[PDB]
Amino acid sequence: PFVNKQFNYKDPVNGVDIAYIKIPNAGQMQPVKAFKIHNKIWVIPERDTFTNPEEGDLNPPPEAKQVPVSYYDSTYLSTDNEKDNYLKGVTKLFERIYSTDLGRMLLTSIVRGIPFWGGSTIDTELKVIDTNCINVIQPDGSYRSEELNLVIIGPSADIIQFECKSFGHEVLNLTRNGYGSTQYIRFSPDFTFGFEESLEVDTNPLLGAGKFATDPAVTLAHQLIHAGHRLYGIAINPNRVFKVNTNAYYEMSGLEVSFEELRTFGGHDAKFIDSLQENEFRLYYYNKFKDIASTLNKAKSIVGTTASLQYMKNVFKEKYLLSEDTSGKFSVDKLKFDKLYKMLTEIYTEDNFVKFFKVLNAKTFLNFDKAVFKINIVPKVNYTIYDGFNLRNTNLAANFNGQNTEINNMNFTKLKNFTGLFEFYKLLCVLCIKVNNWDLFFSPSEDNFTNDLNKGEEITSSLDLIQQYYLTFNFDNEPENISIENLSSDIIGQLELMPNIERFPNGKKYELDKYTMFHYLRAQEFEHGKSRIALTNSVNEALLNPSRVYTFFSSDYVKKVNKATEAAMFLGWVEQLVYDFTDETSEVSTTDKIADITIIIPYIGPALNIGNMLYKDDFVGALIFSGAVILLEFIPEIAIPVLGTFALVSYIANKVLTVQTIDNALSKRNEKWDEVYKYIVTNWLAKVNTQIDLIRKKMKEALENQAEATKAIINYQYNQYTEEEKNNINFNIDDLSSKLNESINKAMININKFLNQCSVSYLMNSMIPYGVKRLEDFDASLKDALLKYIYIGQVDRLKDKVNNTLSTDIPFQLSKYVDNQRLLSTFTEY
């Protein structure tokens, strides 16, 4: 196990594994008790008031942070019992992460990744940096400095803001120049992020309603991935922000997401960056690693400890995986460094940890949080090492009911979040309404996507991979805690300076002439008023009178819900309403007049007002007329310029050299096809898939709103009765709620199928042909050039080979480019 001996906040100070410590700070701080849990890893069950002098208070600031959920409470982690609970939770979380294979990989890598000793001015001498060592005070009083790699401190006033911190150098960027530094992780195991999800309906038709609770193991794995990245000095510069346009009303106010976040999240999240930027980052960090190798080569002396040159040379060689030769020449081998970079960049990702834990979690960042939950995971009756919340041999093992906040009510408590539901907003009007900042579309800018297609080019002559990496990994030896000369009494250090993020303006007003989908979504909202709720089809009426609620069903539904009947036929009323709702939500129209669109669901038309046009049948007509363009709020700007014509190098009288040139030309032709396909797929994912995802989520929200509205109407009607009638009927609205939610799911599968078909048909009809035209022109410009190039020996055979190869376009295989069950499933039938 990771934690060898158990720790509690009552053990008297020892001086080896438990001790009062002092960490670097700008001023002077008092010693704080700390528990070492493994080699080079310590924990401080105290609130973060030491590393950040600016964060010297645990009270809510007047300006709320730009985070969808934030819980503030100064009382937490102030009592001894709370500290013991925190220590137990952290130990259990570390054990759970160490249980899995990928977690063991990550923990071994983090323990191995000791920072670099580049604090010396002499070009041939290595000296430890003060900002990477901490002091431990023995009971007698004589403190001793020690190295370390990780520190866990209870979060700051923002109790769920889990952001890694570090102490940098005056002129060096230790987090991105390959030097590395110890990472202080603000982690809290007693709180979790409670979000909603509806993508598991296909695999779990009996998926429960409500939100879901994120496993804290995933959050700790994310923070640990960030710490491991910053330990190896491969983090991306923070100014590389994923810029998003904010001028449009349908555009976000701002989403400060770094490229490091994209790299850490993994999965589809890692596909928002093009291959060019990834290659640039890889080459830049390769240059940094070779610089580090040269620095190791030129260094001859160690000052600060008794450790010899050989031991530290071996330690840093294991840290950076450098190919040192017989003469001690450390070189950055391309293959080993590439494997290490791939492992740290793509293997160590949140998506892989979600797959390994077998827990429900968000796939992209766009489905922001909605609640914060207080949890206790110290007792085994609530959370176990192996399975987590989804305990085995219970009713919570299947369908991920253990992580449900409505089924596992005993383990979760909904706390108050400080960020108001309409605290950050935009004012849209044509009745100026307030639309939440986190409910808006994600619009990437055109600058974030860069390509080298127009540049010329010259011709010369899954879990399986994780298992293989485990079989090829080593867990034999970890770096030792070598004695080091004591540092100063106070470690003077300053946190790494972060780039300033300008406050996004709040309450920007937009004047329009058409009804946005947000207006229609808001028109289907009520306030649980005691007065009778009336359904209507005019969105203007719903948005003016808050008692009225807009509905996109037929007039029969409105008539049926707007009538009045005594308790004699209410028993019939309930079943008629549930049957009509199930019928209308499950309605479908089949057509073949639009390519790749076999389902043309009409009621989407007036629900989200996608077509800017009232009639649903006219929406059917508009869809079969104009393809999947109507769904997208803003048409993405896809532009493939003229491809770089190949430059084959002539080789006179060397026939086999000519053959190698003609083979490399074909290979790079296929690779160019694949790369253009990948670029277009990335554009489709970034600019179109997010819009369809938001439309799907908003349609689910609208359906749930309609169900809640009709449920409120029937509840109000039932409340109007007498007590004897209520007892005789015994109308249990929970059963009807479950029935209507199941009808919502039965409609949701069809809605998912339709939207998946539309989002794949847009790629097949309006994005791929643009590239295919360019590459067909490229083939036309290449075949004649190659024919000129061949003008001795096997002339005829070469001509047949080239004509056969460039006669047909390479087939588009969506499987190799995007890995998702729904998209592949809908692409299969065509």
Author numbering: 2 to 431, 453 to 483, 495 to 824, 831 to 869
Article excerpt on this structure:
The LC is a zinc metalloprotease that specifically cleaves soluble N-ethylmaleimide-sensitive-factor attachment receptor (SNARE) proteins. While the physiological functions of SV2 proteins remains to be determined, their best-established role is to act as receptors for several BoNTs (BoNT/A, /D, /E, and /F).
To obtain a more complete picture of toxin conformations, we set out to solve the structure of full-length BoNT/A1 by single-particle cryo-EM. Towards this goal, an inactive variant was recombinantly produced in E. coli and purified to homogeneity. Particle sizes obtained for BoNT/A1 were consistent with the presence of a monomer. The HC density in our best 3D class for the BoNT/A1 in solution is relatively poorly defined, which reflects the previously reported high mobility of the HC. Key elements of the HN domain that have been previously suggested to play an important role in toxin translocation, such as the switch region (E620-F667)32 and most of the belt (N493-D546) are relatively well resolved despite the moderate overall resolution of the cryo-EM map (we omitted the first two residues of the belt due to weak density). The conformation of BoNT/A1 seen in the cryo-EM structure markedly differs from the open conformation observed in the X-ray crystal structure. Superimposition of the cryo-EM and the X-ray crystal structure of BoNT/A1 demonstrates that the LC and the HN domain arrangement is very similar and that the two structures basically differ by a ~ 107° rotation of the HC domain.
